[PDB]
Homo-oligomer: A and B are copies of this chain.
Amino acid sequence: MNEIYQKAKHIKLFAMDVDGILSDGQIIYNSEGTETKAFYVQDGLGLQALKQSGIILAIITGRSSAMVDRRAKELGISHIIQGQDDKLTALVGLTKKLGIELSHCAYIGDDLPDLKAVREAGFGISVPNGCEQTRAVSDYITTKTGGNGAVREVCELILKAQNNFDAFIATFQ
């Protein structure tokens, strides 16, 4: 847990995958051509906290949806990359647009397109529903599953590692 905290302490960008991370991985369709996606309410509040403690937020996702666009904006997530399977490339790109390198990125994913990004990121994170290969290259596995607070969980972990957890807690005490 020592080495976990170093990696997190130095994080400047938090980059999330969507399906399996911000959601439980359910891809929903109905009979009139409309897709649906479910997100988790405590995730948003934890992401609002990291936003405001200086850390910038991004989404890199293989699919493309209005739901993701819609959710990211209300959460103050700023960089929205959709229809991108090549995750490490996308991550590196942001690093150079924002002037902080790979060492300064956190990234969280559940599945194979994610592994290289979770491997090279300064702080790579997977979840219990992530395949075994992505988990093995991760610096941290969440207690919680995607769509059920894994994102909020790492949100707190980084805030703890940056010493902004107590300030964030005190705001609501």
Contact B111 A30 (CB under 8 A): no
Does A20 lie at the interface of the complex (its beta carbon under 8 Å from any beta carbon of B)? yes
Are A112 and B172 also in contact (CB < 8 A) when A20-B42, A33-B66, A66-B33 are? Answer: yes
Contact B19 A41 (CB under 8 A): yes
Q: Give A1-45 interface residues, CB cut-off 8 Å to B.
A: 19-20, 25-42, 44-45
Question: Please, how many angstroms separate the alpha-carbon atoms of A42 and B173 in the complex?
Answer: 33
Q: Give A151-173 interface residues, CB cut-off 8 Å to B.
A: 152, 168-169, 171-173
What is the interface of chain A mostly: helix, strand, loop, or mixed? mixed
Query: What residues make up the interface of A, taking CB atoms closer than 8 Å to B?
Result: 19-20, 25-42, 44-45, 65-67, 70-71, 110-113, 115-116, 119, 129, 131, 133, 147, 149, 152, 168-169, 171-173
Are A40 and B66 also in contact (CB < 8 A) when A30-B35, A112-B45 are? Answer: no
Q: How many copies of the shown chain assemble into the complex?
A: 4
Contact B173 A31 (CB under 8 A): no
Distance in Å: Cβ of A105 to nearest Cβ of chain B: 18
Contact A112 B31 (CB under 8 A): no
Q: Please, which residues of chain B bring their CB within 8 A of the CB of A37?
A: 28-30
Question: Please, how many angstroms separate the alpha-carbon atoms of A31 and B149 in the complex?
Answer: 23
Question: Please, how many angstroms separate the alpha-carbon atoms of A169 and B112 in the complex?
Answer: 7
Are A115 and B173 also in contact (CB < 8 A) when A41-B25, A42-B20 are? Answer: yes
Distance in Å: Cβ of A4 to nearest Cβ of chain B: 19
10 contacting pairs across A/B (C-beta < 8 A): A26-B40, A27-B41, A27-B71, A28-B30, A31-B35, A32-B34, A34-B34, A112-B168, A116-B173, A133-B172
Are A27 and B45 also in contact (CB < 8 A) when A32-B34, A172-B112 are? Answer: no
